[PDB]
């Protein structure tokens, strides 16, 4: 009874492949010859943040483009001011293995997670004068890899037990779950209208999930290795993934197939963090050879290189107005390129 | 207005930096360890005698140590093992012994030893369950490995008296099978410290302390370009 079901699954995958080859009229690299190239990108390190001890694993910008969180591997979550390099907050954490952090769109709460399988949400109102543990969410059986805020009441998390989950912060229970992956979900990216979200896993697959319904819509399989990072396009119709096979890939939601592949012959290192600019013309990608690359998203050319880190780049973040790019690596240094 | 706000932010930054310097004085003096092994190897007896992760605090000669054994995680190890690159040593527990467990332990040890981000860390190898090997050698090690027949006891090692020669022969055979792939791509960057331990024993903590002493002394000799 297993041969006929897998045979029908192979026939459905062949029908999907035939539909994608039928919808593939022309590639993106053919009609972008009229668009002028950007050229050499010259950015400099304006600010440098040095207050961490162990390796910085993640960061997230605020909506005002002023404050930013940063999580380290010593049990520290420091909220920095990016303008004057003043440490605004420094939360000591329970477990020192942190893999993700997020900032609320209102600026009131900060979540974090890691190998303890528990998402800790802290409050920044400080009625007494200090921060404290506002909420602890414990419903996963694997390591928490990413977490993002929809609002002050709901939070989308992804864990290492092939499960994503939408949580309600007030009741302390899961609103809904997402069980469709076969590999460890590494990162997720929300929509600009917070209606859908993409999630890439370790089986070379990125799935598009609906928030309110709770079921997978589309599945994208174009990579060869583990997809480590993902980032939604600023308009809301495309996204980009980075994997360990030294290839970035720009996927579309409408055509249900890959549009472009960003690679090179000399790059043989994995990709840890990808992010778009405010206009979506540039695509920044953090690699494992101690520097980041700024690709042109419409010409597939390496327009610039950000080489100022001494260790492996772990996180990259672009502001909402597109004014600066904060890159954090494993040498406990946050560098603000502009 | 803005000047008093900047003064308050500078005072808050000075208090936060003082707290970070105190936490740096606490954090730089402690040595982290990664306890790793299979479920049937005997790491539960190790964490009893000596959530997704469990924390074990102890101290030797007024020197602090934290041991982080893996808890409720899955079988896939290729992503969360990269977070353990700042530890001082990996205490790798194997069971000296129906599936082939020794070959899986050798494959896991080879994948740790040849990892890109695990070239700086040293491995303290603990071959547990020696009395079980002493029982099972009397009445399947030679079947899983045909090199056990063409093998003699190394004369450079000093065994303890009152032991059967086949038991210490199997011990030295498994130790040489680990050191065959240990001494293939080391090149002086990191070493392996094999030890013969039992399930109920209290001398393992001194072995871990002496091996961490050896790791840190070799690191300080290597930073001065001497060794």
């Amino acid at each position, epitope marked *: 009874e297993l041969d006929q079901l897998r045979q029908e699954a192979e026939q459905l995958k062949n029908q999907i492949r035939d539909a994608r080859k039928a919808c593939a009229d022309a590639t993106l690299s053919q009609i972008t010859n009229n668009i002028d190239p950007v050229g050499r990108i010259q950015m400099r390190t304006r600010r440098t943040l040095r207050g961490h001890l162990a390796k910085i694993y993640a960061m997230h910008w605020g909506t005002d483009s002023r404050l930013l969180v940063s999580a380290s591997q010593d049990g520290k979550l420091i909220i920095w001011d990016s303008y004057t390099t003043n440490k605004v907050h420094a939360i000591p954490l329970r477990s020192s293995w942190v893999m993700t952090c997020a900032y609320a769109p209102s600026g009131n709460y900060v979540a974090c997670g890691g190998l303890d399988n528990i998402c800790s949400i802290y409050n920044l109102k400080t009625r007494e004068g200090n921060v404290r543990v506002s909420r602890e969410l414990a419903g996963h059986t694997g390591y928490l890899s990413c977490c993002r805020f929809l609002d002050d009441n709901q939070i989308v998390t992804s864990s290492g037990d092939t499960t994503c989950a939408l949580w309600d912060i007030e009741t302390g229970q899961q609103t809904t779950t997402f069980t469709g992956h076969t590999g460890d979900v590494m990162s997720l990216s929300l929509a600009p209208d917070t209606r859908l979200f993409v999630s890439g896993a370790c089986d070379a697959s990125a799935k598009l999930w609906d928030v309110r319904e709770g079921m997978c819509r589309q599945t994208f399989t174009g990579h060869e290795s583990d997809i480590n990072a993902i980032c939604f396009f600023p308009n809301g119709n495309a996204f980009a993934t980075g994997s360990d096979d030294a290839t970035c890939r720009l996927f579309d939601l409408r055509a249900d197939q890959e549009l472009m592949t960003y690679s090179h012959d000399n790059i043989i290192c994995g990709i840890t963090s990808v992010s778009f600019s405010k206009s979506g013309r540039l695509l920044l990608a953090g690699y494992d050879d101690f520097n980041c690359n700024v690709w042109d998203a419409l010409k597939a050319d390496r327009a610039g290189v950000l080489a100022g880190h001494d260790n492996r780049v772990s996180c990259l973040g672009v502001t909402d107005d597109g004014m600066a790019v904060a890159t954090g690596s494993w040498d406990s240094f946050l560098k603000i390129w502009n | 207005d803005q000047r008093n706000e900047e003064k308050a932010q500078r005072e808050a930054n000075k208090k936060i930096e003082k707290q970070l310097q105190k936490d740096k004085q606490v954090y730089r003096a402690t040595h982290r360890l990664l306890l790793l092994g299979a479920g049937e190897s005997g790491k539960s007896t190790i964490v009893k005698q000596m959530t997704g992760i469990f924390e074990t605090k102890f101290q030797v000669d007024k020197v602090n140590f934290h041991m982080f054994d893996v808890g409720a995680q899955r079988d*896939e190890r290729r992503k969360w093992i990269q977070c353990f690159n700042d530890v001082t040593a990996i205490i790798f527990v194997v069971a000296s012994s129906q599936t082939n467990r020794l070959q899986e332990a050798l494959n896991l040890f080879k994948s740790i030893w040849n990892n890109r981000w695990l070239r700086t860390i040293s491995v303290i190898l603990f071959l547990n369950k020696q009395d079980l090997l002493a029982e099972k050698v009397l009445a399947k090690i030679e079947d899983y490995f045909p090199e056990f027949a063409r093998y003699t006891t190394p004369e450079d090692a000093t065994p303890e008296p009152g032991e059967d020669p086949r038991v210490t022969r199997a011990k030295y055979f498994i130790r040489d099978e680990f050191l065959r792939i240990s001494t293939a791509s080391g090149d002086g960057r990191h070493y392996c410290y094999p030890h013969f331990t039992c399930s109920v024993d209290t001398e393992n903590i001194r072995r871990v302390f002496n091996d961490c002493r050896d790791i840190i002394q070799r690191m300080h000799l290597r930073q001065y370009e001497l060794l």
Partner: nanobody, 126 residues
Framework: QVQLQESGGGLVQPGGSLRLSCAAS????????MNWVRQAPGKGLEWVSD????????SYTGSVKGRFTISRDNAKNTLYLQMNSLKPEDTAVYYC?????????????????????RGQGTQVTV
């Protein structure tokens, strides 16, 4: 899309030979170290053998050493396993597995329960 397909098998006699094939689709074949891993009925998965990227480093299990031969053809994009002088204890489901990272020597999750970078396997009954 990464997909591996096995070929060969059937009912064989002890002391005979059998050639198992593995065809790849969706990736570059000459960059990944390749594995053969069996699973016996009633037991868990156990690693049999591996061949490197360029085909230089070839390693086996001790129980299968001297009776199995693992080879690869990067030009024809295939992985072969020659099984001469068989044993009745070798009745198992065989899988050809791919290590997840390119240009590396370490392979972590090859002999695991839920791994997505290998095929469906083939039954070899002696």
């Amino acid at each position: 899309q990464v997909q591996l397909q096995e070929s060969g098998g059937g009912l064989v006699q002890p002391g005979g030979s059998l050639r198992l094939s593995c065809a790849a689709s969706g990736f570059t074949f000459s960059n990944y170290k390749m594995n053969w891993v069996r699973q016996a009925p009633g037991k868990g998965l156990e690693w049999v053998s591996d061949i490197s990227q360029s085909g230089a480093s070839i390693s086996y299990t001790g129980s299968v050493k001297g009776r199995f031969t693992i080879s690869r053809d990067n030009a024809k994009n295939t992985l072969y396993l020659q099984m001469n002088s068989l044993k009745p204890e070798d009745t198992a489901v065989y899988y050809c597995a791919r290590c997840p990272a390119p240009f590396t020597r370490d392979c972590f999750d090859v002999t695991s329960t839920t791994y997505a970078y290998r095929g469906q396997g083939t039954q070899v009954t002696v």
